[PDB]
Scaffold this active site. Structure first.
Site, short mmCIF file in Angstrom:
data_model
loop_
_atom_site.label_atom_id
_atom_site.label_comp_id
_atom_site.label_asym_id
_atom_site.label_seq_id
_atom_site.Cartn_x
_atom_site.Cartn_y
_atom_site.Cartn_z
N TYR C 154 0.82 -1.20 0.00
CA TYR C 154 0.00 0.00 0.00
C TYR C 154 0.86 1.27 0.00
CZ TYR C 154 -3.83 2.96 1.67
OH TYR C 154 -4.73 3.96 1.87
N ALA C 155 1.88 1.29 0.85
CA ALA C 155 2.83 2.41 0.91
C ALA C 155 3.54 2.64 -0.41
CB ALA C 155 3.86 2.17 2.03
N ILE C 187 -8.73 8.26 9.15
CA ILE C 187 -10.05 8.83 8.95
C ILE C 187 -11.09 7.81 9.41
CG2 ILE C 187 -11.63 9.87 7.25
CD1 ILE C 187 -8.99 11.34 7.66
#
EC number: 1.1.1.100
Lengths: 247, 247, 247, 247
Positions: C154-155, C187
């Protein structure tokens, strides 16, 4: 060998009595530099002279005073030739949350940790540019990049040195002078040894490597940037923080 | 000396036939590493064997092929012991403005320049973590941090390697493996020599140092991070670009 | 008012069924854009049609499939006119520590989270450049800049999107298209709500603001960059992370 | 609408006579803030009062003088209530290459462009923290991040403000106060209009967007960060430079 070989370079290392500054001075000398380390007192200068032996000398330098700067550089030039490598390591802390930070605590940090870099850098640069060869290496802090609660003054000064460094780097690159910053994380020193167990553990919790850095590890990074081999590195900030921050 | 000494370390350097990769392989050997350098072709591999001599050997490796990676690591472990230092240098370019960029030009760059780093890093990490000691060093590019028109693929891959590097650094820091990137600027290579004079001049105009970097300058930065002395540097990107970009 | 007014702009928002993507679609509609939001399933697409009502519509889109992209853009151009604002929000996670990370977990993240951005950006750019006006906004992640253990894939993808973004920004700046990334921190979403209390607390401990972000806070940043008023912001990464990371 | 709505906020904008500062003050007022703009003279204060009309007032402020700061904040608090939004825009230049830079040129920049930010920020922070709501937005420069030859003092001060900002951000985030920097590139102002054609063209050559920014574009970025919607952005530097630099 001819690898990372500083024979023929004159290095001025400010704040070289102990810790990171001492480790820097010792390694530059080990790699062949003639090293002048400074302290704020003659006693400190003598201790530096003692550890450096035939590889250099200690000198008393008031980093916030123009007159002292002139006398010290004159003495170095006369005996050793022009300074080829300046390592700006001398720095102080005056920690406080902003609402408690005194005017004097701000101005002392600006003076010692930022304006001093402007002064010393300017004072050694003319000779470096004439030779078309030179190294200016500022010892910064992870805090200049990350920020830290309770150290807005320190952070401001350290961050300021980076902006100064990049601008200097752009000014003098085509004349073979490099200007860089080494930014230590949490390094084992008298100050860190003076923290209690809870504070050390809390700080270590933020370091992926899970230990404090050694002063020699900061020294190695400085020595690398001081070397002929680092001639194509300028305007850079080299972080040595065990992963505490990753840019 | 004991300084920046890689005796006892086994280094795998991908894409070591010429330029930066060759310079890396040679300098790691000079510092005492046993070095395995790779090329795509057996004749490339033999040229690597020939320049390394008693200090290592060349092997054919396809960095996009799992079976090839497995075979090469097996051969290295059998003869030398497990890889202690991985240098991910193999990379390609497939330049085009986005509207002219073919799907395969995108995917080939992802495969060769980013996915290969995942694959090879994973393949060497198990051994390094058992030993609680290791070095993974990616050879990136200023383009990853700066961006460059006509190289959105290359930029994406190189920037991706940095994200990967930071994440892996976080994963394995407490087990003594560091993971870092060296980001070269414009380095003198065959590709830069094939540029015409107007192109060379235009690129030099963006380099404050006013010259191209030498492959040995990239090698020096890689050797530094590979060293014991760099154990406290992880998740970092070391820029070697003559001031072309300043972070 | 004329302030931050998107009347006359056609916005494509990928992955708009819930959370951040939904918040983006709703706010762009509120600011006057005609909005096409996408989902993987026709029922997802219908839910998007239902919340947008007269201000746009939902379409099924597979962001890893060229034929689907072509069909969706055709339908949008036919009914609304060409896309003026692309928001690349569709993304997945396939978390694992590297030693447990499967090849498909790597490749699926590359395809969905990075290659899709290449494909969609290319597909919309031609129209934007003919008009000499456009906005491409990538919804990234603090993880792209910070790295995160267990999310190296993902990074890497998110960091790659930034490299792509900077390169494309350079390519198309002079033709009035900006290309930027919004990088959310932690979030409040379904995924964060499914964390247990110990995991939520541990993550909040790394957020100076001491709370999770709201999807509308990400939407606000995306609406700002989409605006006429943001025409001089390009190649930028806007961090919205409550101080979790400070660049 | 309730979007980007500053009704009920009191904004203090330093250096608001013209250019970027004036554009900031006008937009904050347009979005509903009660705005106090400052100038170094009463004449300047009057011109600010004239453009602001019923939406605020002009005040004379010596940004390098404690006593002036106290009187101005007292007057604002009495009439308007506590300052909710501080925009630190007042700044000077004293350009020179380092070898020509006077002691006074360094200290004037440090005073006006850095120490002033420490002073004003501290003076407004207590009220913001009691309310658990506040915005501090520093108007920086691309030069603080990029460096610039001939502006090592300016760069140092601007870079210092970022380090101060991040530390302040960490100190006060959990109390609902955000602290951020907006970093303009080359913006059209009296100073840029005073450059000759060759200098403008040379500067524009470094801007991918191919034009100077408008002061209103800086205003929009400040207004965004001042808004309720930007509550999850802190310790950030928002670059508005047309791609001149990409971080």
């Amino acid at each position: 060998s001819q690898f990372m070989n500083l024979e023929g370079k004159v290095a001025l290392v400010t704040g070289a009595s102990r810790g990171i500054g001492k480790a820097i001075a010792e390694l530059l000398a080990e790699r062949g530099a003639k090293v002048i380390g400074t302290a704020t007192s003659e006693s400190g200068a003598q201790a530096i002279s003692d550890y450096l032996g035939d590889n250099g000398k200690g000198m008393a330098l008031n980093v916030t005073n123009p007159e002292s700067i002139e006398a010290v550089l004159k003495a170095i030039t006369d005996e050793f030739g022009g300074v080829d490598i300046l390592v700006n390591n001398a720095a102080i802390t005056r920690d406080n949350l902003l609402m408690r930070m005194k005017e004097e605590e701000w101005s002392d940090i600006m003076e010692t940790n930022l304006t001093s870099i402007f002064r010393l850098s300017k004072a050694v640069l003319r000779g470096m540019m004439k030779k078309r060869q030179g190294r200016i290496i500022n010892v910064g802090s992870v805090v200049g990049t990350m920020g830290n609660a309770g150290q807005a003054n320190y952070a401001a000064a350290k961050a300021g040195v980076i902006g100064f460094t990049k601008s200097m780097a752009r000014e003098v690159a085509s004349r073979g002078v490099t200007v860089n910053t080494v930014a230590p994380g949490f390094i084992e020193t008298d100050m860190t040894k003076a923290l209690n167990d809870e504070q050390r553990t809390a700080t270590l919790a933020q370091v992926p490597a899970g230990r404090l850095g050694d002063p020699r590890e900061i020294a190695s990074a400085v020595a690398f940037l001081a070397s002929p081999e680092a001639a194509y590195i300028t305007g850079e900030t080299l972080h040595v923080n065990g992963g505490m921050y990753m840019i």
